[PDB]
UniProtKB/Swiss-Prot annotation, chain A:
Binds to activated (phosphorylated) protein-Tyr kinases, through its SH2 domain, and acts as an adapter, mediating the association of the p110 catalytic unit to the plasma membrane. Necessary for the insulin-stimulated increase in glucose uptake and glycogen synthesis in insulin-sensitive tissues. Plays an important role in signaling in response to FGFR1, FGFR2, FGFR3, FGFR4, KITLG/SCF, KIT, PDGFRA and PDGFRB. Likewise, plays a role in ITGB2 signaling. Isoform 2 is expressed in skeletal muscle and brain, and at lower levels in kidney and cardiac muscle. Isoform 2 and isoform 4 are present in skeletal muscle (at protein level). The SH3 domain mediates the binding to CBLB, and to HIV-1 Nef. It is linked to Agammaglobulinemia 7, autosomal recessive: A primary immunodeficiency characterized by profoundly low or absent serum antibodies and low or absent circulating B-cells due to an early block of B-cell development. Affected individuals develop severe infections in the first years of life. SHORT syndrome: A rare, multisystem disease characterized by short stature, anomalies of the anterior chamber of the eye, characteristic facial features such as triangular facies, lack of facial fat, and hypoplastic nasal alae with overhanging columella, partial lipodystrophy, hernias, hyperextensibility, and delayed dentition. The clinical phenotype can include insulin resistance, nephrocalcinosis, and hearing deficits. Developmental milestones and cognition are normal. It comes from Homo sapiens (Human). This is Phosphatidylinositol 3-kinase regulatory subunit alpha. The modification Phosphotyrosine is found at residues 32, 145.
From Swiss-Prot, chain B:
Neddylated. Attachment of NEDD8 is required for the E3 ubiquitin-protein ligase activity of the BCR complex. Deneddylated via its interaction with the COP9 signalosome (CSN) complex. It comes from Homo sapiens. It is found in: Nucleus; Golgi apparatus; Cell projection, Cilium, Flagellum; Cytoplasm, Cytoskeleton, Spindle. It is linked to Pseudohypoaldosteronism 2E: An autosomal dominant disorder characterized by severe hypertension, hyperkalemia, hyperchloremia, hyperchloremic metabolic acidosis, and correction of physiologic abnormalities by thiazide diuretics. High-glucose conditions in renal tubular epithelial cells lead to up-regulation of CUL3 expression, significant increase in CUL3-mediated ubiquitination of MRPL12 and dysregulation of mitochondrial biosynthesis. This is Cullin-3.
From Swiss-Prot, chain C:
The gene is KBTBD2. It comes from Homo sapiens. The keyword Transferase does not apply. CDD domains: BACK_KBTBD2, BTB_POZ_KBTBD2_BKLHD1. Pfam families: BACK, BTB, Kelch_1. This is Kelch repeat and BTB domain-containing protein 2. It comes from the Eukaryota. Residues 25-92 form the BTB domain. Recognizes the BCR (BTB-CUL3-RBX1) E3 ubiquitin ligase complex substrate, PIK3R1, through the 4 tandem C-terminal Kelch domains. GO terms for biological process: gene expression; glucose metabolic process; lipid metabolic process; phosphatidylinositol 3-kinase/protein kinase B signal transduction; proteasome-mediated ubiquitin-dependent protein catabolic process; protein K48-linked ubiquitination; regulation of cellular response to insulin stimulus; response to insulin. The modification Phosphoserine is found at residue 294. Substrate-specific adapter of a BCR (BTB-CUL3-RBX1) E3 ubiquitin ligase complex that acts as a regulator of the insulin signaling pathway, modulating insulin sensitivity by limiting PIK3R1/p85alpha abundance in adipocytes. Targets PIK3R1, the regulatory subunit of phosphatidylinositol 3-kinase (PI3K), for 'Lys-48'-linked polyubiquitination and proteasome-mediated degradation. PANTHER family: KELCH-LIKE PROTEIN 22, LD33804P.
Length: 165, 207, 564
């Protein structure tokens, strides 16, 4: 602390360093909580997008099952001059195509949600990558000052009161 | 239940409200007239009732005011104006007392205005906001306030009744009042003040 | 200098004294031949209808005789009684007719009281009838409350005759609502099929509107069984809170499809300094903790119960004396996440052993009141009748006892004895005595075996047979030595389990659940409860098994992860 011969002045510095370190541990565990919530976020979002994928697959399976029905039991429902009986697969086809379109739009919505959350997570993930060297450097300076200034005439209770503010 | 039964009830209600509009609602059993309204709106037929009532009152308005523009416009204008105003007010209050259950159950459903607000709106638009009556009333009001400014005494009851009914027609404050009467009043007062200031400062001292 | 009540309460009773002796009768109301003389002033102050007909001052208001049609004489007398007293006779037999007479007369006071009375009268029998009653009279408050009840028990009320007589608009909003509590889409389809065949000549034109509301191409959970169950351990639950979270609302899985068995913990500890007795639940499948609201408003020492019909209730308890014991009773809403109140108990209670038997809920024990009169207080409740009734008390007064139900029989256990109650006989029969004297233990039921586990606790497990009436030791809960495990017996996935919270010397609380082997008489490690969730819940916590809406309950991650 600039070899201040006041000693009380050297102790006042120690208190400023206390603040710096404390602010960091709080933001450090806050960034850890953010890391964990983002991890479970992309986990729930990947279990949702693969569910979307398998649903699209089974819907395409139903789409080709419609072509299978166009040869299995369509012979007795198209040559009779009726349209209400065929609605069980014909009115269940156009709305299935519209469902395909809207779930593709929903998948695009989930993809843009994924990229925007990844952006808002990486814009602070780089902050973690830059705050940790400074954090460990400040902690090393605090540990070096602990060997010197603490053993003059400070109390451990005084250090606790300084780090508790 | 049956549609012809509802139509007969609606026709009875039409005859009843038309007799009430004739200012002869005295000796007439109208206790059923409510029962009837209730049954009607309960079979959920409120839309019909409301719309038809609107139609009837609007047509009554047309007849009456065409008549008034053709004749009442000249003979004692503001007199018959406030006369028809209070007559329509009493009639619509009586109708509201008759159709209050509809105002309770059906008005809050379609977010429409109540029968009292509806009657005041249609009286403001079809009767007051009409073309050939608006210019006449504003010119008469400007003329009477102008002669009031230059010493000619006018019955303040007529103008105060006109202003109070105009601010009542706002149903939200003096909204219509700003555009129907205040807008010409401010400019005519401004030009009159300019003229009087020019004629005063020219041949008088400050004392 | 305002209005005086010592004078208002005297003026009102003076008016009644004149009404009984028929003084100042200025109007006579004629209803289906019956005469009712009254005052035009009193009817106007109570009913706005008479206020409108009398201020009219026409032939009706001029004629002392007024004929009122479509008005019941019994309901009219009750309306006049209220106008002169302020007391309202609201019974479940004539409440629907009184509301029709009140709305026809437009009495703000009676309509408001009859509305709130019906809201708390909706059970599992009149729900459909009250729903059509609300739509006919346009009561938006009763209609919403009745609709939510239909959505909660749609699989149980669609067989009633009131369901097939519903209007077309009353059907299109029930089927389209995603709150239908149904496990399969076929139940909703068959419910729509029985509705259209009830009256074919009048509903043949609505066949298109019926099929347009039932989801046919939805394929909610039949797609997961198609591909495979390949996922992290029982992660079919994460898909439930994912497909229902993003969908066009036409192919959404109904709320019934969205269900998860969760260990309901009531009166647990709170992570942040807040409600000392909080309520949270943990889904073993989703590995997530869901927060539950407490409308009880700081209730303490309450009991829990879960019916086989998946209904949750709480009774008894104590509230902080502004602690005093009360007789409150609340029902949990699986969709609105609230705690509606229900007919209170006859006697105040603290942690009563609530059990469901043959559709009846029984409150056992619960803070004995009046030691001179009786200490073994017990009473039953009727769900549809909303009424409490006293029953045969326990043979002796005990403390910290448990109660279970096996094969429609009520079993209560104590220090070393056990008594079986038969509702068919309304008596108590002493059963086989227990070999070990234990208190504060947990009890559970599974199949034909009753488990009285824990108690002083210990790891001793007792298996009792109803068919043999014998108490025998089977095994000991495998736990670490010198530990203090506060165990709770719970049955899940048709298997008995033990939710064991272990607290060791200088170590934090550890939660873990084991599965017992019935054939091998062994305890198998089922699932370790992640310590990244499920913070310390203390020891006095109550626990039970139930299914809730993962889809909709509460979302509070919190629980700061990766520490140290």
């Amino acid at each position: 602390v600039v070899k201040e011969d006041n000693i009380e002045a050297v102790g006042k510095k120690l208190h400023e360093y206390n603040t710096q370190f404390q602010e960091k541990s709080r933001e450090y565990d806050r960034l850890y909580e953010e890391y964990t919530r983002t991890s479970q976020e992309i986990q729930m979002k990947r279990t949702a997008i693969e569910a979307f994928n398998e649903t699209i697959k089974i819907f395409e399976e139903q789409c080709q099952t419609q072509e299978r029905y166009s040869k299995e039991y369509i012979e007795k429902f198209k040559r009779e001059g009726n349209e209400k009986e065929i609605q069980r697969i014909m009115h269940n086809y156009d709305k299935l195509k519209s469902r395909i379109s809207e779930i593709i739009d929903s998948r695009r919505r989930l993809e843009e949600d994924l990229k925007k959350q990844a952006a808002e997570y990486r814009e602070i993930d780089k902050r973690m990558n830059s705050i940790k060297p400074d954090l460990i450097q400040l902690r090393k300076t605090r540990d070096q000052y602990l060997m010197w200034l603490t053993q003059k005439g400070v109390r451990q209770k005084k250090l606790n009161e300084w780090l508790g503010n | 239940m049956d549609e012809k039964y509802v139509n007969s009830i609606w026709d009875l209600l039409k005859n009843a409200i038309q007799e009430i509009q004739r200012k002869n609602n005295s000796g007439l059993s109208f206790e059923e007239l409510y029962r009837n309204a209730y049954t009607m709106v309960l079979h959920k037929h409120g839309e019909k009732l409301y719309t038809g009532l609107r139609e009837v009152v609007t047509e009554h308005l047309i007849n009456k005011v065409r008549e008034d523009v053709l004749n009442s416009l000249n003979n004692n204008f503001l007199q018959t104006l406030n006369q028809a105003w209070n007559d329509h007010q009493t009639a619509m209050v009586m109708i509201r007392d008759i159709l209050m259950y509809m105002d309770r159950v059906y008005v809050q459903q379609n977010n429409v205005e109540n029968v009292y607000n509806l009657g005041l709106i249609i009286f403001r638009d079809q009767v007051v906001r009409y073309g050939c009556i608006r210019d006449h009333l504003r010119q008469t009001l400007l003329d009477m306030i102008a002669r009031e400014r230059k010493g000619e005494v006018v019955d303040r009851g007529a103008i105060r009744n006109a202003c109070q009914m105009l601010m009542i027609l706002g149903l939200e404050g003096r909204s219509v009042y700003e555009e129907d009467f205040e807008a010409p009043f401010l400019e005519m007062s401004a030009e009159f003040f300019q003229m009087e200031s020019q004629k005063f400062l020219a041949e008088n001292s400050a004392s | 200098r305002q209005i005086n009540t010592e004078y208002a309460v005297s003026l009102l009773e003076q008016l009644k004294l004149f009404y009984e002796q028929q003084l100042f009768t200025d109007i006579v109301l004629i209803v289906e031949g019956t005469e009712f003389p009254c005052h035009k002033m009193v009817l106007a102050t109570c009913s706005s209808y008479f206020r409108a007909m009398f201020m009219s001052g026409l032939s009706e208001s001029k004629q002392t005789h007024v004929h009122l049609r479509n008005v019941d004489a019994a309901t009219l007398q009750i309306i006049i009684t209220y106008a002169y007293t302020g007391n309202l006779a609201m019974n479940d037999s004539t409440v629907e007719q009184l509301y029709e007479t009140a709305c026809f007369l437009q009495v703000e006071d009676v309509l408001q009281r009859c509305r709130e009375y019906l809201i708390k009268k909706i059970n599992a029998e009149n729900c459909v009838r009250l729903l059509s009653f609300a739509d006919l009279f346009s009561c938006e408050e009763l209609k919403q409350s009745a609709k939510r009840m239909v959505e909660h028990k749609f699989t149980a009320v669609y067989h009633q005759d009131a369901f097939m007589q519903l209007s077309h608009d009353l059907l299109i909003d029930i089927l389209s609502s995603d709150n239908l509590n149904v496990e399969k889409e076929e139940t909703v389809r068959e419910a729509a099929m029985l509705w259209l065949e009830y009256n074919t000549e009048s509903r043949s034109q609505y066949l298109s509107s019926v099929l347009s509301q039932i989801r046919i191409d939805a394929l909610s959970e039949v797609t997961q069984r198609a591909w495979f169950q390949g996922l992290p351990p029982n992660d079919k639950s994460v898909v439930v809170q994912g497909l229902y979270k993003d969908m066009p609302k036409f192919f959404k899985p109904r709320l019934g499809m969205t269900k998860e068995e969760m260990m309901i913990f009531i009166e647990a500890s709170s992570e942040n300094p807040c409600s000392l007795y909080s309520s949270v639940c943990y889904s073993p499948q989703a590995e997530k903790v869901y927060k539950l609201c407490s409308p009880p408003a700081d209730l303490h020492k309450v009991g829990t119960v879960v019916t086989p019909d998946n209904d949750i209730y709480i009774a008894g308890g104590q509230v902080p004396l502004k602690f005093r014991t009360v007789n409150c009773f609340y029902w949990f809403d699986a969709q609105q996440n609230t705690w509606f109140p229900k007919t209170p108990m006859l006697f105040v209670r603290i942690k009563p052993s609530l059990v469901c038997c043959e559709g009846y809920i029984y409150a056992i024990g619960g803070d004995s009141v009046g030691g001179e009169l009786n200490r073994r207080t017990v009473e039953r409740y009727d769900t549809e009748k909303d009424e409490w009734t006293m029953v045969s008390p326990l043979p002796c007064a005990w403390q910290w006892s448990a109660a279970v139900v096996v094969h429609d029989c009520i079993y209560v256990m104590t220090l070393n004895l056990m008594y079986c109650y038969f509702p068919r006989s309304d008596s108590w029969v002493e059963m086989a005595m227990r070999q070990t004297s234990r208190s504060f233990a947990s009890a559970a039921a599974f199949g034909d075996k009753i488990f009285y586990i824990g108690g002083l606790s210990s790891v001793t497990v007792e298996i009792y047979d109803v068919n043999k009436n014998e108490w025998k030791m089977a095994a000991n809960i495998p736990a670490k030595r010198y530990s203090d495990p506060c165990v709770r017996a719970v049955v899940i996935s048709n298997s008995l389990c033990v939710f064991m919270r272990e607290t060791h010397l200088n170590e934090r609380a550890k939660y873990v659940t084991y599965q017992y082997d019935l054939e091998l008489d062994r305890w198998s490690l089922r699932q370790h409860i992640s310590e990244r969730v499920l913070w310390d819940l203390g020891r006095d916590f109550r626990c039970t098994v139930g299914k809730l809406y993962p889809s909709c309950l509460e979302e509070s991650p919190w629980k700061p992860p990766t520490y140290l």
